[PDB]
Enzyme design. Structure first.
Site, PDB file in Angstrom:
ATOM      1  CD1 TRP A  34       0.230  -2.967   8.783  1.00  0.00           C
ATOM      2  CD2 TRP A  34      -1.542  -3.320  10.109  1.00  0.00           C
ATOM      3  NE1 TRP A  34       0.386  -4.199   9.367  1.00  0.00           N
ATOM      4  CE2 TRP A  34      -0.687  -4.443  10.186  1.00  0.00           C
ATOM      5  CE3 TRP A  34      -2.725  -3.319  10.864  1.00  0.00           C
ATOM      6  CZ2 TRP A  34      -0.977  -5.560  10.990  1.00  0.00           C
ATOM      7  CZ3 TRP A  34      -3.015  -4.430  11.663  1.00  0.00           C
ATOM      8  CH2 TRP A  34      -2.142  -5.534  11.717  1.00  0.00           C
ATOM      9  CG  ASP A  66      -1.897  -1.089   1.233  1.00  0.00           C
ATOM     10  OD1 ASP A  66      -1.564  -2.186   0.723  1.00  0.00           O
ATOM     11  OD2 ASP A  66      -2.987  -0.885   1.800  1.00  0.00           O
TER      12      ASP A  66
HETATM   13  O1  LIG Z   1      -0.256  -3.536   5.105  1.00  0.00           O
HETATM   14  C1  LIG Z   1      -1.539  -3.625   5.742  1.00  0.00           C
HETATM   15  C2  LIG Z   1      -2.456  -2.739   4.909  1.00  0.00           C
HETATM   16  O2  LIG Z   1      -2.707  -3.381   3.648  1.00  0.00           O
HETATM   17  C3  LIG Z   1      -4.123  -3.547   3.399  1.00  0.00           C
HETATM   18  O3  LIG Z   1      -4.512  -4.887   3.855  1.00  0.00           O
HETATM   19  C4  LIG Z   1      -4.521  -3.440   1.912  1.00  0.00           C
HETATM   20  O4  LIG Z   1      -3.551  -4.067   1.068  1.00  0.00           O
HETATM   21  C5  LIG Z   1      -4.700  -2.414   4.271  1.00  0.00           C
HETATM   22  O5  LIG Z   1      -6.101  -2.529   4.491  1.00  0.00           O
HETATM   23  C6  LIG Z   1      -3.818  -2.442   5.516  1.00  0.00           C
HETATM   24  O6  LIG Z   1      -3.721  -1.183   6.195  1.00  0.00           O
END
Ligand SMILES: OC[C@H]1O[C@](O)(CO)[C@@H](O)[C@@H]1O
Ligand SMILES: *[C@H]1O[C@H](CO)[C@@H](O[C@@H]2O[C@H](CO)[C@@H](O[C@H]3O[C@H](CO)[C@@H](O)[C@H](O)[C@@H]3O)[C@H](O)[C@H]2NC(C)=O)[C@H](O)[C@H]1NC(C)=O
Ligand SMILES: *[C@@H]1O[C@H](CO)[C@@H](O[C@@H]2O[C@H](CO)[C@@H](O)[C@H](O)[C@H]2NC(C)=O)[C@H](O)[C@H]1NC(C)=O
Length: 537
Positions: free
Chosen positions: A81, A21
């Protein structure tokens, strides 16, 4: 032999390891900041994920810095995250992100730069009161994440949405605040959808009607519409509509709730996920970033030492018809163009293949436009409920039609034993109405095993009678970004042909249909590498 023949030459990616992300994109004090989910310990996802950080003056050439946000407090001790950046009045960039606390629950945390004198904003400080937001009542601890960029309403109150779900129903939880520190959940969600699973990386922003420009997230008005974007069931979906701050109501223009069906719109119809956008007030444009996953195996990732790419940043705006969004790579990419090879008024007879010479076939920007003759010959096929991806997988480049398949053969070997075919097909319903299909046939993109070679496709909203079918392709080794009809239909592909380890790649134009098609014009540029300087440790 070539070392790491799959690494891109002008796409953003870290020196190595795993990246997913894109995080907190923004433009601050003339510097473009980019962050991203990163695993410092492997080329796979892991228990410890942190925010990578890189900066740029043009969104093309980057400087890798040390990670900006990493576990330092209980509110994010297990991982940091996804999140977004919001520049608050007073010129202070505020970062909201989802942390995994000591009890392993997803909570929303705040952070901001600790030294605004630093053009690169390397050091960040965390709010003493984190977490600022915790899972609502009937929401599980691992289904509440990805806070969006905030928007300030006319009443001077900030709004943000957080992803997640309530009983498997996708949610864009809405929160309000005046100081950006104390947030209160609004009674109802901004938007939602049944049985879609967790809504990841929600994005909510305005787009100007009858304009190809972008708007600050806090703009509103009658000449403005809002986009509600959310990732679920493996893809990024979005819907255009009207927003009413007063009663926190978002009304879909087509009155539909996202279902993740062929009824909904996507930014890209290939490998494209966790997309996030930000407003560039210098160029007055909204820029979109997206993670492009690997389609090779985990073993392949661990072996080559890295995994994950970012799509090339693209400008985002609403179409003149107001029914969909348009994407196009930011103009800065044009500065990478080197020598050019052009073609005009060239006929492509049935079943022909024309090779483009003098171009770095593994790293190029190719544009082509097709002039069609005898549309009436188009195969009869009503496509009202047809699934474009299923259709492309059913009929690849080897399936010969009347009008189509005609297009490009990228990342192809001299013998064509391996090739990636991006092409079009034209159909008509019983009433004589035409429809256009765009495909990314990856079925023969590689002879390697354990490679996801699923093809991608989508219908292009254009009238073949009055406008030529155009296609732009960003070719960069293991990634290909296809833009049909000026950006009305985008498809990102990941390919891992085997030949890249010995011989060079080739570029071709082809027409495997029974009808003749003409290339009115075609432009191909070799793309020089983007610079990636490391300034870490
Ligand atoms: O890396 C963890 C992050 O990646 C996700 O699963 C989407 O790819 C988000 O919802 C989360 O914040
Ligand atoms: C579009 O035109 C052709 C339409 O079929 C397609 O032909 C492919 O190559 C030959 C040509 O007839 C055939 O190959 C068949 O036999 C080989 C034997 O080794 C098999 O390996 C193949 O799987 C297949 O059964 C097929 O007709 C077809 N096969 C494939 C997929 O290669 C051309 O390849 C097409 N042209 C382009 C640019 O894609
Ligand atoms: C805050 O940022 C400024 C600007 O980057 C830092 O100042 C630079 O510091 C380096 C190393 O000390 C010097 O080589 C530069 O010449 C300095 N330039 C400036 C703008 O004075 C400053 O050190 C940072 N503050 C902290 C606490 O790290």
């Amino acid at each position: 032999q070539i070392e790491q023949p799959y690494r891109t030459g002008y796409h953003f990616q870290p020196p190595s390891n795993w990246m997913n992300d894109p995080n907190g994109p923004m433009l601050y004090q003339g510097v473009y900041h980019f962050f991203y989910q990163y695993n410092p310990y492997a080329a796979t996802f892991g228990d410890v994920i942190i925010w990578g950080h890189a900066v740029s003056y043009d969104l093309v050439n980057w400087i890798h810095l040390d990670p900006a946000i990493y576990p330092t407090q209980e509110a994010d001790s297990k991982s940091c995250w996804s999140g977004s950046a919001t520049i608050l009045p007073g010129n202070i960039p505020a970062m909201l992100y989802t942390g995994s606390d000591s009890k392993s629950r997803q909570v929303q945390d705040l952070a901001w730069p600790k030294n605004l004198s630093d053009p690169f904003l390397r050091e960040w400080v965390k709010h003493p009161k984190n977490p600022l937001i915790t899972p609502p009542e009937g929401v599980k601890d691992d289904c509440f994440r990805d806070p969006s960029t905030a928007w300030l309403g006319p009443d001077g109150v900030w709004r943000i949405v957080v992803g997640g779900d309530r009983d498997n129903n996708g949610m864009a939880f809405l929160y309000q605040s005046t100081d950006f520190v104390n947030w209160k959940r609004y009674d109802q969600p901004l938007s939602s959808a049944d049985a879609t699973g967790t809504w990841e990386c929600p994005d909510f922003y305005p787009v100007p009607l009858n304009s190809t420009n972008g708007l600050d997230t806090s703009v509103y008005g009658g000449s403005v519409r809002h986009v509600m974007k959310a990732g679920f069931e493996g893809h990024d979906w979005y819907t255009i509509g009207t927003y009413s701050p007063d009663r926190e109501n978002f009304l879909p223009q087509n009155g539909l709730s996202l279902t993740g069906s062929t009824l909904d719109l996507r930014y890209d119809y290939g490998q494209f996920y966790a997309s996030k956008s930000f407003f560039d007030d210098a160029k007055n444009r909204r820029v979109l970033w997206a993670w492009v996953p690997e389609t090779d195996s985990q073993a392949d990732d661990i072996e080559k030492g890295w995994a994950g790419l970012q799509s090339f940043p693209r400008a985002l705006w609403i179409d003149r018809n107001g029914k969909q969004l348009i994407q196009w790579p930011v103009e800065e990419i044009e500065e990478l163009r080197q020598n050019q090879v052009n073609l005009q008024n060239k006929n492509l007879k049935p079943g022909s293949v024309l090779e483009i010479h003098g171009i770095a076939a593994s790293q190029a920007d190719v544009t082509i436009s097709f002039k069609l003759e005898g549309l009436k010959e188009a195969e009869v096929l009503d496509t009202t409920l047809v699934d474009p991806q299923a259709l492309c997988n059913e009929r690849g480049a080897s399936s010969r039609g009347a009008l189509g398949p005609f297009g490009l053969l990228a990342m192809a070997s001299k013998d064509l034993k391996e090739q990636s075919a991006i092409f079009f097909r034209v159909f008509q319903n019983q009433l004589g109405r035409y429809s256009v299909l765009m495909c990314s046939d990856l079925s023969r993109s590689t002879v390697r095993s354990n490679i996801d070679t699923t093809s991608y496709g989508a219908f292009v909203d254009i009238d073949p009678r009055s406008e030529e079918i155009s296609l732009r392709n960003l070719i960069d080794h293991s990634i290909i970004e296809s833009f049909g009809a000026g950006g009305k239909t985008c498809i990102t592909s990941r390919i891992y042909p085997k030949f890249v380890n010995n011989e060079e790649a080739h570029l071709f134009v082809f027409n495997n249909g029974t009808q003749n098609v003409k290339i009115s014009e075609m432009s191909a540029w070799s793309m020089k590498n983007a610079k990636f300087v490391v300034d870490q440790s």
